[PDB]
Every structure is written in structure tokens, then in C-alpha cells.
Amino acid sequence: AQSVPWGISRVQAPAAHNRGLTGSGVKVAVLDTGISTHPDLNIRGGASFVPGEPSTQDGNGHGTHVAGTIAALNNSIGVLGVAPSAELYAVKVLGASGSGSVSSIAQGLEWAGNNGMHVANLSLGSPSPSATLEQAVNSATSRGVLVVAASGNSGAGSISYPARYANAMAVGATDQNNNRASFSQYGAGLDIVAPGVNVQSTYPGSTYASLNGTSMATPHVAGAAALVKQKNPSWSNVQIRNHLKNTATSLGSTNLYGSGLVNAEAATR
Amino acid sequence: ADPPPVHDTDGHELRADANYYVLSANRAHGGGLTMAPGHGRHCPLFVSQDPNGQHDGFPVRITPYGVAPSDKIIRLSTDVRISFRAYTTCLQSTEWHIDSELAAGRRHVITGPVKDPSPSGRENAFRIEKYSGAEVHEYKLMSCGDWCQDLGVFRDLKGGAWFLGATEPYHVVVFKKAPPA
Ligand SMILES: [Ca+2]
Ligand SMILES: [Ca+2]
Ligand SMILES: [Cl-]
Ligand SMILES: [Cl-]
Ligand SMILES: [Cl-]
Ligand SMILES: [Cl-]
Ligand SMILES: [Cl-]
Ligand SMILES: [Cl-]
Ligand SMILES: [Cl-]
Ligand SMILES: [Cl-]
Ligand SMILES: [Cl-]
Ligand SMILES: [Cl-]
Ligand SMILES: [Cl-]
Ligand SMILES: [Cl-]
Ligand SMILES: [Cl-]
Ligand SMILES: [Cl-]
Ligand SMILES: [Cl-]
Ligand code: NA
Ligand code: NA
Ligand code: NA
Ligand code: NA
């Protein structure tokens, strides 16, 4: 039967669903290892930018898990996304190995701009700066994409790239007591946090799996953006971002948590 | 004096922080270097060699280990840090280190953090040396702590991933500058 993962209830998505906000009409791209067809997902399309790996199917599992946290279907099986009616696009920019180049990722962001994505979720990164990668984020942002990226798993006091670039919204991970998970990177670049420990979601072969990471936190925010956008279709990527921050539940220092815990109920009220 | 420089495939001296693919000197020996995960536990990713001579892998950024020298030319037989220009589901450092001199087992080159660094923590120090083969400018990679160890590739044709590590024959390489990047 369908379970509501605890992070879905923590971000208060069901209260948004009760006010008729499920993310319908919102285009969300998952820039990741691909998305496997799964009973509890609806994949509208996408593209691959990984040499040798032409399909948008997930040979790793990661992108499929991230996609379920955003948009796992509301039905009688598996789990439930923050935004179960969001239109999901699989943009493979990482190989099955789990790694991608500046160029794969940059072509994925260009794809998101050219196809009118409202949200791009990038649960991926590293400490490697790249001006070419920053330009691509800036370009997608100028074309209306809200770029949402994981703060990183190193535990350090600065955040990963691309999340660290100003026009990515950087997301850290919280635990079941609203504390920063110890791996979750923070710093001045951080915008907001979301659940990222024991996050059950969709997994290839019609399965489910419980992962920990800032990669799990990020889709909670990408989903909430989709809810805000459904409610306010004329809002820019910037207005959505500010509103998610303005309505977040403050948890302590902005350096450790940014605005605090994303709150889909307050964001859509 | 201070050691001679390492050169890229275009004859220019290697510079700190510029991006270079690490290609096999002999294309018959395979492709450039990438990252490959566990089968079970994905992260940390290992450094591996693409078996396909046509695949360049990810470029690497090379920086002097220790105090910053003024010119920024990468020199032979001089400790340097090496990290991939790449982005991962692991969201961890892409800097290389070799398995600790103090650990049991084979030694591989891996990326990311370690639980239990060695006292000196020199496992992230590598050197580029001249290969007595090198009709033209071709190199071997080594890691030195209390001994020096040249790096080769654990080939497997399964094939599982071809892991870089303490094994001979050594992996002879060349550095190709990433095209305007
Ligand atoms: Ca479901
Ligand atoms: Ca070998
Ligand atoms: Cl749960
Ligand atoms: Cl209402
Ligand atoms: Cl499409
Ligand atoms: Cl495609
Ligand atoms: Cl494929
Ligand atoms: Cl089920
Ligand atoms: Cl660069
Ligand atoms: Cl630039
Ligand atoms: Cl930061
Ligand atoms: Cl709590
Ligand atoms: Cl299946
Ligand atoms: Cl599970
Ligand atoms: Cl790290
Ligand atoms: Cl071993
Ligand atoms: Cl070789
Ligand atoms: Na940012
Ligand atoms: Na901040
Ligand atoms: Na679980
Ligand atoms: Na030579």
C-alpha cells in the first residue's frame, strides 16, 4: 500500500496537496544518472548527454530515487512525492558510474532552457570550480529555469559546486530531529535545508530504497518549488526561490541552515 | 637546479590548475582516466582507465604539493596533488590519493576522503617521472611516502573496471590539454 516517507510529511507536502497543489503543469528536469521506468513514476521525456549512454534509463539508481522524492505518484503503491503531478523529465548528465563532466552537465542545463523546464534538480557536485559550468547555470536561470542543487556530503563549512554558484539554490540535509546531518555541507552559499536521512524513494527494478545524502534533500525543495509555481504561474524563478526561503522554518544559524527547513504548507498559504 | 618541466602533447609546459586529459601514451593500451564505483558501495569512486583508446576520460588539474612556487610550471619528480574536473552523485572531493602504505591489501588510487589518514598524510602526493621509453614526451606516475610506488592498471576483461594502482607493467601516459574548456 502507499507510504508517506517521513521527509514528505516533514516538509508538509500533504497539506499543500489538500489545497489542490500537486505540481500539475510544472516541468521539472532531473539532471542525474537517468530515470528508470517505474510503476510509481510518470516520465514525460528527456535526453541524454553522456557519451556511450544514449538512453535516459538509470543504470545507477540515484536519479530514479531523486525523481521519486519529487514526483512519486499518488496511488495505492510505493511512496508519494512532494509534487506527485509534476511533469518529470530525465536528463542524463551522469553516467552509470555516477560521474559527469562540465560538458555533459552544461548541455543538460542548456537542454532545460531550450525545453522550458521550470525547475532543474541537480543532486550532484564536487569541490571543482568551473567558469563554464557557472555560465551554464546563469544561462538556464536567465531562461526561466529554477536551478536547485545539493550542498554536498563532505561535512565541510563551504558548499559544493554547482550549488555554490549564486544562481543555484543550494540545499542542505536535515535529520528526524531537524538537526543538520553531519555530512551536510554548509556556508554562506547555502539557501535552505530539507530531510536527507533515511529517505525512502523509488529505485530501479520496481523497488524502493532508503538513502542518506544532500542529494535526497534537494528533490524535496525542487518539488516544493513546483507547488509554489502551480499556485503562482506568473512568478519568476527568483520569486519562487525567495518565497521558499521567506517561509522556511528557521532552525538556527543561517550559515548552517540557510533560511531553515523548507515548508511547503507555509510556501503555498 | 629545480627539475625540468613536464610537457603536454602539444609540447607546452604543464601549468598548475590547467586541465589535462591523462591519456595512454600508446593508444593501443587504452583510453584516458575516469572514476568507477563499488558494485555495492558506490562512493568513494576509484580512479580507473577507460579501455577504449577513443575515450579521453575526465581531465585532471595538477597543483604543487606544499608551498606555492612562483612560476606554476609542473616539474618532474616533484610532489603534486591531482584531482579530476568532474561532478559526482558522491558530492565529495575528486582529489586522488593512493591507499595508505599502512593498510593491508592491494593499493589502489581513489578519490574522496578517508577514515583514518596516515600520520604524514602523504598519500595524496604523486610524482610524474620520465619513462625510458619516451620518444616523445611520455611519463609514469608514482606515489612516494616511505617508499616510491609506480602506478599501473589492474586490467580485467570480465571486464570489471580497470583500476589504477600498485601493479606493473606501469601505465605510461601523456597529458593532453582540454580543448578551450
Ligand atoms: Ca505511490
Ligand atoms: Ca596491468
Ligand atoms: Cl519513512
Ligand atoms: Cl488555500
Ligand atoms: Cl522530451
Ligand atoms: Cl537524447
Ligand atoms: Cl544508456
Ligand atoms: Cl507497494
Ligand atoms: Cl575549467
Ligand atoms: Cl566565464
Ligand atoms: Cl559556501
Ligand atoms: Cl523535530
Ligand atoms: Cl522493472
Ligand atoms: Cl527501504
Ligand atoms: Cl571530501
Ligand atoms: Cl585488495
Ligand atoms: Cl600503459
Ligand atoms: Na548557490
Ligand atoms: Na546563505
Ligand atoms: Na528506511
Ligand atoms: Na621524451
Residue A2 marked ligand-binding:
yes
d(CA A109, CA A140): 6
**Where do we find the cell 516538509?**
A11
On whether any CB of chain B is under 8 Å from the CB of A205, the answer is no
What contacts B160, CB < 8 A, 6 or more positions away?
Answer: none
Domains (range + CATH), chain B: 1-181 (2.80.10.50)
Q: Do A126 and B36 touch (CB under 8 A)?
A: no
The candidate with the shortest Cα–Cα distance to B166, out of B100, B115, B116, B112, is B100
Active-site residue A250, yes or no?
no
CB A193 within 8 A of CB A260: yes
Residue A79 marked ligand-binding:
yes
The candidate with the shortest Cα–Cα distance to A256, out of A196, A188, A195, is A188
Three cell numbers written together for A31: 539532471
The pair phi, psi for residue B29, each rounded to 5°, is -90, 0
Active-site residue A175, yes or no?
no
Answer whether the bond into residue B64 is a cis peptide, omega within 30°.
Answer: no
Active-site residue A62, yes or no?
yes
A269–chain B nearest CA distance, Å: 34
Q: What is the 3-state secondary structure (H, E, C) of chain A?
A: CCCCCHHHHHCCHHHHHCCCCCCCCCEEEEEECCCCCCCCCCEEEEEECCCCCCCCCCCCCHHHHHHHHHHCCCCCCCCCCCCCCCEEEEEECCCCCCEECHHHHHHHHHHHHHCCCCEEEECCEECCCCHHHHHHHHHHHHCCCEEEEECCCCCCCCCCECCCCCCEEEEEEECCCCCECCCCCCCCCEEEEEECCCEEEEECCCEEEEECCHHHHHHHHHHHHHHHHHHCCCCCHHHHHHHHHHHCECCCCHHHHCCCECCHHHHHC
CB A86 within 8 A of CB A28: yes
d(CA A224, CA A169): 13
d(CA A98, CA B86): 10
Contacts with A100 from chain B: Cβ below 8 Å: 86-88
Give Cα separations from B173 to A137, B4, B57, B152, B154 (angstroms). Answer: 34, 17, 13, 10, 15
The pair phi, psi for residue B166, each rounded to 5°, is -75, 85
CB B97 within 8 A of CB B108: no
CB A154 within 8 A of CB A127: yes
Resolution, expressed in angstroms to one decimal: 1.9
CB B162 within 8 A of CB B30: yes
On whether any CB of chain A is under 8 Å from the CB of B36, the answer is yes
Q: Are strands A87-92 and A43-48 parallel, antiparallel or unpaired?
A: parallel
d(CA B91, CA B139): 31
Domains (range + CATH), chain A: 1-269 (3.40.50.200)
Quote the distance between the C-alpha of residue B117 and its chain's center.
19
What contacts A62, CB < 8 A, 6 or more positions away?
Answer: A32, A33, A94, A98, A123, A215, B89
B95–chain A nearest CA distance, Å: 9
Q: Do B87 and A33 touch (CB under 8 A)?
A: no
What pairs with residue A194 in β-bridges? Answer: A173
Q: Is B69 helix (H, G, I), strand (E, B) or coil?
A: coil
Name residue A161's amino acid. Y
What pairs with residue B154 in β-bridges? Answer: B163
Around Cβ B105, how many Cβ atoms within 10 Å? 7
CA A177 to ligand 13 center in whole angstroms: 34
A97–chain B nearest CA distance, Å: 5
d(CA A128, CA B175): 19
| Probe site for chain A from B49, B87, B90, B95 (most A CB atoms < 10 A) | B87
Q: Where are the beta strands (DSSP E) in B65-151?
A: 80-84, 87-88, 96-98, 109-111, 126-130, 139-144, 148-150
Q: Is B64 helix (H, G, I), strand (E, B) or coil?
A: strand
Contacts with A127 from chain B: Cβ below 8 Å: 83, 93-94
Q: Do A126 and B88 touch (CB under 8 A)?
A: yes
Around Cβ A188, how many Cβ atoms within 10 Å? 12
